Structure formats: C-alpha cells, structure tokens
Point group: C3
Chain length 114, copies 3
C-alpha cells in the first residue's frame, strides 16, 4: 500500500536496456530529463590554512519512476545491474516516500492511480 518514487541520476548511456528491463518487471511509465552533475573536491592552497575547491560539471540523466505494486527493491536492483560499469560516473539512486498519487484522467488515488 506504500508508494515510492525512485530517482536514478546517472550517465546518459544505456537508457534503452533500462527501459527493457524496467518494462519487464512491471513499470509502465517513467519521466526523465537532462541535468548537470558537479563534483567537488578539497584542494590545497599554497598556505597551510587554505582550502580551495575544485569542481567539474558533467552530464546527467535524471529518471523518475513511481511504484506501488511493483516493488521498489526490484526496481533498484534492476537499475544497478543494467547501469553498472564500474567506471566512475555510474550515478546514484534515491528512494522517497510518496504521501499520495492522483491519476488526473480517471480521478483515482493511491496505488490504483498508477
């Protein structure tokens, strides 16, 4: 009866295999968009006190999936397998509780709106 939002923030490649795999476990829709990632790291300044921050901006794909019947853990596990390449920039996955969902066309609320 819970409802969750799965947020995948990752590298722009491999999207198609994801749609295949998410599709197979029950997901029937999702949203996505391009955003930017920024890495931050403490660097030395010349003085003993000094910190200075170095940063790079890269490309990221943000994918959002809402789920209720389809179990979160099956969504996240599938996301790991498919998007794992070991090389840095594989991204992360965030899970959130949802208080409610409303299907606009039908007017249903809860896991039946999905």
């Amino acid at each position: 009866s819970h409802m969750f939002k799965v947020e995948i923030v990752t590298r722009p490649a491999n999207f198609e295999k994801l749609k295949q795999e998410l599709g197979k476990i029950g997901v029937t829709s999702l949203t996505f968009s391009n955003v930017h990632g920024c890495g931050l790291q403490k660097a030395h300044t010349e003085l003993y006190r000094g910190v200075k921050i170095e940063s790079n901006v890269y490309e990221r794909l943000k994918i959002e999936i809402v789920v209720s019947k389809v179990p979160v853990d099956q969504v996240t596990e599938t996301a790991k397998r498919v998007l794992k390449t070991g090389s840095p920039g594989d991204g992360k996955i965030f899970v959130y509780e949802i208080s409610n969902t409303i299907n606009i066309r039908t007017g249903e609320e809860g896991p039946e709106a999905l």
Copy 2:
C-alpha cells in the same frame, strides 16, 4: 503546520487556466519545467517465452507547488478539474511531505517561509 510539495506531471496545454485557479485559492508561486514521459508496454515476441518492451516518448510539463496554509487537497482537486480532458495523457499528481522550508531573503523557517 505540515508542509507539502505538490508535483503535477502533465500535458503542456492548459497552463494558463491553472495559474488562474491556483492563484485564486491562495498559491503565490510555483516552479515548472519541460521533461519527457515514457510509456512502457509488454509486447509479444515470436517465441512463447519472449517479452519485448515497446515505448513512446512524449512531452511533459512538470509543475511544483509547495503549500502549508493552503490545503493540499484544495490544490490537488483544482488541478484535477482544470487539467482533466478524459483523453489519455492527462498526467498525474504526486504529494510529498517536506521536512522544512527556508526563505533565503528573510531567513524564516516553516510555513512562514512560504
């Protein structure tokens, strides 16, 4: 005293009537952006075992509204009326709890930051 985020993910039309209606019930600001929606459906392959996923990418408008005094249910109900057209692609509405809000200019926290 609760604070909520209302997330409307919908078809790019009808935005103006929404601003009128949300405005009238008390909303004084919101954010929006264009993202993509992806539908996923299980299709037959030629073999008895085989699943294959078919997908379409459409345009979506993401609208975010934070509320405290103005009741969530008045926001969501208004959103339904205005954006309902019966035809598929009417979109959905997601509700989330917010731990806190901070107005950057004034420095206030909670439903007074809004």
Copy 3:
C-alpha cells in the same frame, strides 16, 4: 543515519561561491538545472466580485544536494549566507527525508553510498 535531500531554488547568480562554501563543509557532489519560477498575485477586476490573477515568469536555478554525514543544518545555513542579497528573488530551500540511497558503481546502500 538519516539521509536528506536539500533542494535550493534560486537566482542564477552566485553559483561559484556556493560550490566553494558547500565544498568546504564536506559536500562532494550535487546536481543542478534551470527551471522557471512563476509568481502569482490576486488582482482586482472591475466588478466587486472579481478576482483576476497576474503572473510573471522568471529564471531559476534548481540545486540538489543529498547529505547524511554532512549535517543538513550546516548545508542550509551556508546556503542562506551565500545566496542572501535581501532583494526579492533570493529563492527558497526545501528539505526532504530520503528512504534510501544506492551507489550504482559500488553497490552500497545508506549513508555509505554517498
């Protein structure tokens, strides 16, 4: 052991000083994107009954930071200082609970995925 998402929605300027300050307190990555803000205000119509809504659309920078070890309140306080200019359009900051985080490359969950 909690995990939080800090969402800063603000004016497109001052981003660099932010990266410096967030970097110094422990943040090693964040995401951002350009979205739109819309102000809504009740205006008079000519008739005694009539409300009419006036709205402006401006530019906004959405910045997302996930934190666990690094304390939310140190993130939000730093965000205030740096982005405060008193003039309207300073933006807001929203805090959310996160049920879980997963590092895709390593496979770790919780505050160790960050």
